[PDB]
């Protein structure tokens, strides 16, 4: 109906007008007097050398010592990052995995991918082996991201333009989030685990209230598919990484763009983003085969992590901020500090 | 300077590494084929003789094959087609009788052009399969090729039409030097499709081995 289209158009126009009215000064003007952090020198302290294929995902445990990585060789490996020891090696039924998660309790790990199934593995069993605790098969598209809320709740992002909240005890979709018009590629949970943001291929990011299925806000401004998303440590902002070689910072309360992290010599897309413990550094994996450390406030590049010989697909930061783990399409993970 | 528990943990890690090495050695001896095509082509018919990704295993002449039929994936091919980079070959199924209408042949050309001229499949050979040759002959007995091929100057015989379709599918390859396209008219008479796939895979593996030696 023409009336409905006109109503939607005028609502979008009023939203844009409100955003412009709330825009009085960019972050760069306010932060210009802040002293730059200077060059950030990061060295490869550890190298994990167990995988045999492209690594697509990695996650840190609630402790800053254990981490899990996923690769296309059908293996889930849990590393003792302090000693580069392999705690576990979980063989997957489907080797086409593009996501990985570590439970905050440390008792479970999750995996998923082209099989459209999110599999939960029990790491602490009386039998002494890791077993598949539950398989979630309610998605009609490839699993792109999954994050644990607790031992019983997991939120997953799929390529069917929908995100779903699950209940591992029953294995049924407790809630379904349907607001995206394109494949959802990334997911990030708020520190309070009451909200989460998703980045889809429609060049938009949406803020979901996990309590009940609802899209509180929609963030736009990217010019291509969003491949990575990550929440600011404070919890009132998040960063996105798209294929247009730019990273952007959005604030939930202001509901607006804040800063764009782009450089002319960078033309490749961003595969992963993450913050530091204080939020002053924004690490971002690229297809330039190296990670770029961005000053989250001044939007100036601070350092480069050029230890990888292929595309850096996944990147994570420990809870205490002690180290940075970068996975890439060469079968190596690197711990920087 | 490791404690007893640390030494035992290192031993467990070494055992896990050994198991990983054995698994990788076993996996590297398998031939990975990506099966593509249209929704109505003879993909199933190709897969007859032997929710998301459908994986098929079969063995021929002591060689283990793994066909990954990613057909029930209505998502964007751009965001997961890089996962299949490094497969031995791509098996493309095209229905020769899809030239009638509903233009299906043009959709097959578009899909083949997208797959062949892709930044990920720069040097992966494509095994092109042309199915339904008998029904194609039956259709070409009565109906004209000219429906799908307005700029076609040739007789309405099965040989000429089949050759022209093969050429029109082959010339879409821009990387005629780094990638070779093998075409076989699929026939259900006997197990010749598997023989053609094995021959093409052996060709690709020979070329890859020569690349590794630094002599290709």
């Amino acid at each position, epitope marked *: 109906l023409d009336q409905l289209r006109q109503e939607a158009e005028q609502l979008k126009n009023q939203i844009r007008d409100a955003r412009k009215a709330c825009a009085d000064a960019t972050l760069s003007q306010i932060t210009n007097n802040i002293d730059p952090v200077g060059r950030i020198q990061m060295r490869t302290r550890r190298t994990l050398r167990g995988h045999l294929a492209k690594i697509y995902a990695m996650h840190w445990g609630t402790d800053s*010592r*254990l981490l899990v990585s996923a690769s296309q060789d059908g293996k889930l490996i849990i590393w*003792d990052s302090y*000693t580069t*020891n392999k*705690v*576990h090696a979980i063989p997957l039924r489907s080797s086409w995995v593009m996501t990985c998660a570590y439970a905050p309790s*440390g008792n479970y790990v999750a995996c998923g991918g082209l099989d459209n199934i999110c599999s939960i593995y029990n790491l*602490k069993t*009386r*039998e*002494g*082996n890791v077993r598949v605790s539950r398989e979630l098969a309610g998605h009609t598209g490839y699993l792109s991201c999954c994050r644990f809320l607790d031992d019983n709740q997991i939120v997953t992002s799929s390529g069917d333009t929908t995100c779903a909240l699950w209940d591992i005890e029953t294995g049924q979709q407790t809630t379904t989030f349907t607001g995206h018009t394109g494949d959802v590629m990334s997911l990030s949970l708020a520190p309070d685990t009451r909200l989460f943001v998703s980045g889809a291929c429609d060049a938009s990011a949406k803020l979901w209230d996990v309590r009940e299925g609802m899209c509180r806000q929609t963030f736009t401004g990217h010019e291509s598919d969003i491949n990575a998303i990550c929440f600011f440590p404070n919890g009132n902002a998040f960063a996105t990484g798209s294929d247009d070689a730019t990273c952007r910072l959005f604030d939930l309360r202001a509901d607006q763009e804040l800063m764009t992290y782009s450089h002319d010599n960078i033309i490749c897309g961003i595969t992963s983003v993450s913050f530091s413990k204080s939020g002053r550094l924004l690490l971002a994996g690229y297809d330039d085969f190296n990670c770029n450390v961005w000053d989250a406030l001044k939007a100036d590049r601070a350092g480069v992590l050029a230890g990888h010989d292929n595309r850096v697909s996944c990147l994570g930061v420990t809870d205490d901020g002690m180290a940075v783990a970068t996975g890439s399409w060469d079968s190596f993970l690197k711990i920087w500090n | *300077t490791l*404690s*007893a*528990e*640390d*030494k*035992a*943990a290192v*031993e*467990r890690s070494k*055992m896990i590494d050994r198991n990983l090495r054995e698994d990788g050695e076993k996996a590297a001896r398998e031939v990975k084929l990506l099966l593509l095509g249209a929704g109505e082509s003879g993909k199933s018919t190709i897969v007859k003789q032997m929710t998301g990704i459908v994986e098929t295993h079969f063995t021929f002449k002591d060689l283990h094959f793994k066909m990954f039929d990613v057909g029930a994936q209505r998502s964007e091919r751009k965001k997961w087609i890089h996962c299949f980079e490094g497969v031995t070959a791509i098996i493309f199924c095209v229905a020769l009788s899809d030239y009638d209408l509903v233009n299906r042949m043009h959709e097959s050309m578009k899909l083949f052009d997208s797959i062949c001229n892709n930044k990920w499949f720069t040097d992966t050979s494509i095994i092109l399969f042309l199915n339904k040759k008998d029904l194609f002959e039956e259709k070409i007995k009565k109906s004209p090729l000219t429906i799908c091929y307005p700029e076609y100057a040739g007789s309405n015989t099965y040989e000429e039409a089949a050759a022209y379709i093969q050429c029109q599918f082959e010339d879409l390859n821009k990387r005629k030097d780094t990638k070779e396209i093998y075409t076989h008219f699929t026939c259900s008479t006997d197990t010749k499709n598997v023989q053609f796939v094995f021959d093409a895979v052996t060709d690709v593996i020979i070329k890859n081995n020569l690349k590794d030696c630094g002599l290709f």
Partner: single-chain antibody
Amino acid sequence: DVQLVESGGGLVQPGGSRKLSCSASGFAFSSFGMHWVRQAPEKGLEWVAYISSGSGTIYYADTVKGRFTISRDDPKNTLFLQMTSLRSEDTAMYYCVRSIYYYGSSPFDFWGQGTTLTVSSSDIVMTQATSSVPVTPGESVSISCRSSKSLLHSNGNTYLYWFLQRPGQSPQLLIYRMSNLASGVPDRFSGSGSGTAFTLTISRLEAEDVGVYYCMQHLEYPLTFGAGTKLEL
């Protein structure tokens, strides 16, 4: 569930070559490192031997080195102890403790039912300094154990283990590495202490806590237990 059943006991004349067998069922035996721990009729526990996962590492006690042979055969999930030149000092009940070793693991978590064997006629010294204390239900008691060397390692974890041997029952793991609580153990039990000085606090104790408590060190081989602290009433 997890089960460990041992067989091969009975009377053995001195100089015999009786073999002990331990059948495992209910867990991935091929990945667990297995121990043999004996216990004299009225003395404390004494670690005998140990074979790692994959049989790559094997250790023996000095009292049994050269005479006892340990072996595991994963296919049928069975652990063997080949005892030769048996003497009167080998009259003890032998256990088939299992132990998994990785970051955060809990070794010695499950003990076998025990098989009796009767023979007819630089190590860290761990001291408990006590034999038996009177306790009433609903009370809190503190069991103290002492070590010669410092169990604190440069890693940061002190390798002290606590086991409870209820009357007529196998020892059960309670605290591993002096701080962590074993699975299935109530929160009433607590472990604490520092180098060469540890303490076990059973706050608000009741029935089923009656038995002998043994403190073990896992800093380095050979593994040594305490003399055992007994609870009555």
